[PDB]
Amino acid sequence: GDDELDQEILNLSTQELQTRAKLLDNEIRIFRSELQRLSHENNVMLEKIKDNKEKIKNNR
Amino acid sequence: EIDTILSTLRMEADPSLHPLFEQFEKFYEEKLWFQLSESLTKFFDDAKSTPLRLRLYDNFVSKFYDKINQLSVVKYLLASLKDSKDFDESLKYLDDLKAQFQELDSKKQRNNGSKDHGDGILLIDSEIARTYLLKNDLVKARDLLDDLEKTLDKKDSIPLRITNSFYSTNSQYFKFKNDFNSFYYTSLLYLS
Amino acid sequence: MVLEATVLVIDNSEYSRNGDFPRTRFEAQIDSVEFIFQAKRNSNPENTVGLISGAGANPRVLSTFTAEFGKILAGLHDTQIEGKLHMATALQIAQLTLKHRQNKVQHQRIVAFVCSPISDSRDELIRLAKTLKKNNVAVDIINFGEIEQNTELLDEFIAAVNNPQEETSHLLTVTPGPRLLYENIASSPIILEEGSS
Amino acid sequence: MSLQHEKVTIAPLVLLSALDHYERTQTKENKRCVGVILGDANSSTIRVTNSFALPFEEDEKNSDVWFLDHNYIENMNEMCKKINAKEKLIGWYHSGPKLRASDLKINELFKKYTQNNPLLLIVDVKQQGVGLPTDAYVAIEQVKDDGTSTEKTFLHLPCTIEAEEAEEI
Amino acid sequence: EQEAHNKALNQFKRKLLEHRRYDDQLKQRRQNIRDLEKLYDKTENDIKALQSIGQLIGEVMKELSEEKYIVKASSGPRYIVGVRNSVDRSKLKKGVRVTLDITTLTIMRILPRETDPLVYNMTSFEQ
C-alpha cells in the first residue's frame, strides 16, 4: 500500500482517498470473478488427467 | 475538460451540424454510450470533408477505446484520412492509433473476456497499405496485402468489414497498375 | 423460493457497455450472478441454475441445468456482447430448458435481466406470457432496459402470468442511478418471495 | 476449419443408428431427432464412422426455437474416446425429409467444437432417394457474385460409402 | 499522521495491498492452467496412439494382378493381399516396404526402406 495514507493527503484530497478504496472494491469484485473462474478450470483439468491416466496404467 | 473543446467545435460548425454537436455532450455526461455511437455516425456523413471531423474524433478516441464500440471507432478513422490530402499526416496518425489498441488488448481483452480489440488492428493496417498507394508505392502495399490475405483465411468467422477493407486495398493497387480486369474481379467481390 | 430451478437470461448488448451502472453493466452482472447462485444454494442445495444468453442473432444455451457454480461462471467467459437479446424467442428456448431438471420437484422460474428497450410486439409477447403459466413457468423481470425512456409492455406481461400458482411473477424495476446493480438485486426479495395458490 | 471438401463417405452404421434413435425419442410431425455426428475430418472426404443421440427438443410452432443440451456433448465425447480416441464432432445429423432454414442457425452451435465446417447428413426414415437414402451438405460461407450478400449456405457434395469388410459381410 | 481520519486510511492502505497481492493470485493461477494444458495433452496424445493398432511390414515380392499383390512379410511367410486406394500401383514396385493390416492384410501405405538395428550402431562408430 504505497497510497491511501499520509503520503497521499498531499497529492489529492482526503475524500479522494475515501472513495478510491471503494473503486478498488469494484475492481476486486471483478478479480474475484476471474480467480474463481480459474478455480473451476483447474478442478476440471486435474480430473481430466485422472480420466486419461487410468487407462494408461492399465496398459502399462 | 472535453466540454470546452466540444463547445468551440460547435460554434465553428455549420448551423445544421450544430444540433448534432449538442448530442455528443449529452450522451458523454449521461454514460449512455451506445447512443453516443449513434450521434457520431449521423454527424460524420455530412461532415466527411469538413475539418471539424478529425478534431472531434481525436477527443473521443483519447477518452474511450472500448466503452464505445471498437469497430465503429476505427471505421471513422479510415475515412477521415482518405479525405486527408496529406499522406504524411495520414500515415503517422494511423500508426500512432494502431499502437494504442495493441497496448490496450493486453489488459481489456482478458478481463472483459467478451470483446476483442485485435480485430480493429487489422482494419487500420488496410489503410496503411493504401497510404502507400496514395504515395504511389505498389510494392510496400503488396507486402501488407499478403499479410492481410493470409489473416482473412486464418479466421474462420470473418466480419464483412474486414474483407471489404482488404479488397479496397487490392482494388486501388490494381488501377495504379492500370490493369482493368484485375480491378473488376476485386470490386465485384467487395461490392457484394 | 425453495425447491426451484432458475434459468437466468442475461441480456447481451452494447447497452451494457454503458457505464451508468458499474463500471460497465456487464461487469456488474458478473458479480450479480455469483451472488444469486449462493443465495438459492444456501436456501436449499437441491436447487440448480441454468444460464442462457441473448448473444447472437438468436438466443443460446451457455449452460444447461447444473449444480456447478463454476459452469455458470465459465459460460459468461464464453459469451460475447455484440449480440442483441430478442425476448420472444428467449422465453420459448427457456421453456424447453425448464423441462429438463435435476429432479422434477424443482419448480420452474425464469429470471431475466433487461438492459435494452425491447422492440418485439406487445400482442406477440402476450401470447407467450400466457403460455408460461400453462407450463407452470412464472417469470421475474428485473427491468433496467425499458426505463431508459420506453413504455411498459411489461405491465401486461406480469398480470397475464399471475394466477393461482405457487410460482409467482414479479416486476422489479432497479434504480438506474449509481447504487450498484448487484447490491440492489441481491437485497431485493428473491428468497423471501411468496406464492399465489 | 477445413474449407476444402470434396466428398462425404458414410459408414452403413450411421444411417441405421439414426433411424433407431429416431423411434426411441418417438419423433414425428416436425419434431425431428437431431444427434451429433462422429468421425474423421480435416479431410476432403468426410468419413463418418458413428452417430449418437443428444437430448434435443424441436418445437413445431417455431423451428428457430430449439433446445440443445450443450453440457451433455462434452461428457459423451469423453466416452467416445473410451471406444476409440479417433472420433470427434464433424457435424450433426438431421432425421427429416429435407433441409430446413432453421438448420443454418443450428449449424452455428457445432462450429464451436469442430475443426471442420459442420456436416448436415439428412438420414431419411422413409428411405427415399434412387441412390442412398442420405443427402449430404456441408455449410460454407462465401461471397455470392450475383449481386447478393454473403450467405452461409449448404452446398451439396456427393455421397459415397466406406464400409469395413467385417461389417459389410 | 496529520489527521484522525488517517486512522481510517490505514484500513484503506490495507485493502490496496490485499488487491495488489490478489493480482499475484491472478498471475499464479494463470501460470498453472497453461502448464496443465500441455500436461493434459501429453496424456491425451497417449490415448490416440493406444487406441490405434499396429501394422505388419512386408515388401512387394511380385505383382499377381493389379488389385492383388504377393508380399513377403517380415513375420516371414508370403501372403496374397489387396490394397487401399491411397497407395498408387506405380509407386508399388518390388522391394518397396509396405504396411499390411494385421486383421485384414491390406496395404494402407508405402513405408520407407527397412534398415538393420545393427547398422545404426555402425554410424555411431567413428569415435
Task: Provide an overview of this structure.
The structure is cut from a larger assembly and holds chains A (60 residues), B (192 residues), C (197 residues), D (169 residues) and E (127 residues). Chain A is an all-alpha fold. Chain A contains 2 helices and no strands. The longest helix of chain A has 44 residues. Chain D has a single domain, classed as 3-Layer(aba) Sandwich (Cytidine Deaminase, domain 2), CATH 3.40.140. Helices cover 23% and strands 33% of the residues of chain D. Chain D is globular, with a radius of gyration of 16 Å. Chain D starts with 6 loop residues before the first strand and ends with a helix. Helices cover 35% and strands 20% of the residues of chain E. Chain E is built from 2 helices and 5 strands. The interface between A and E is medium-sized, with 32 and 34 residues.
Structure, briefly:
Chain D has 169 residues and is of the alpha/beta class. Chain D has helices at residues 12-24, 70-83, 103-110, 165-168; strands at residues 7-10, 34-40, 45-53, 56-58, 66-68, 88-94, 119-123, 134-142, 151-156, 159-161. In chain D, the strands form two sheets. Chain D has an eight-stranded mixed sheet. Chain D has a two-stranded antiparallel sheet with strand order 4-5.
Q: What topology emerges from the helices and strands here?
A:
This is part of a larger assembly, with chains A (about 60 residues), B (about 190 residues), C (about 200 residues), D (about 170 residues) and E (about 130 residues).
Chain A: H1 8-11, H2 16-59
Chain B: H1 2-12, H2 18-30, H3 33-45, H4 52-63, H5 70-83, H6 87-112, H7 118-134, H8 138-154, H9 160-177, H10 180-191
Helix pairs in contact in B: 1-2, 1-4, 2-3, 4-5, 5-6, 5-7, 6-7, 7-8, 7-9, 8-9, 9-10
Chain D: E1 7-10, H1 12-24, E2 34-40, E3 45-53, E4 56-58, E5 66-68, H2 70-83, E6 88-94, H3 103-110, E7 119-123, E8 134-142, E9 151-156, E10 159-161, H4 165-168
Parallel strand pairs in D: 1-3, 1-10, 6-7
Antiparallel strand pairs in D: 2-3, 2-6, 4-5, 7-8, 8-9
Function (chain A): The 26S proteasome is involved in the ATP-dependent degradation of ubiquitinated proteins. The regulatory (or ATPase) complex confers ATP dependency and substrate specificity to the 26S complex.
Subcellular location (chain A): Cytoplasm; Nucleus
Protein name (chain A): 26S proteasome regulatory subunit 6A
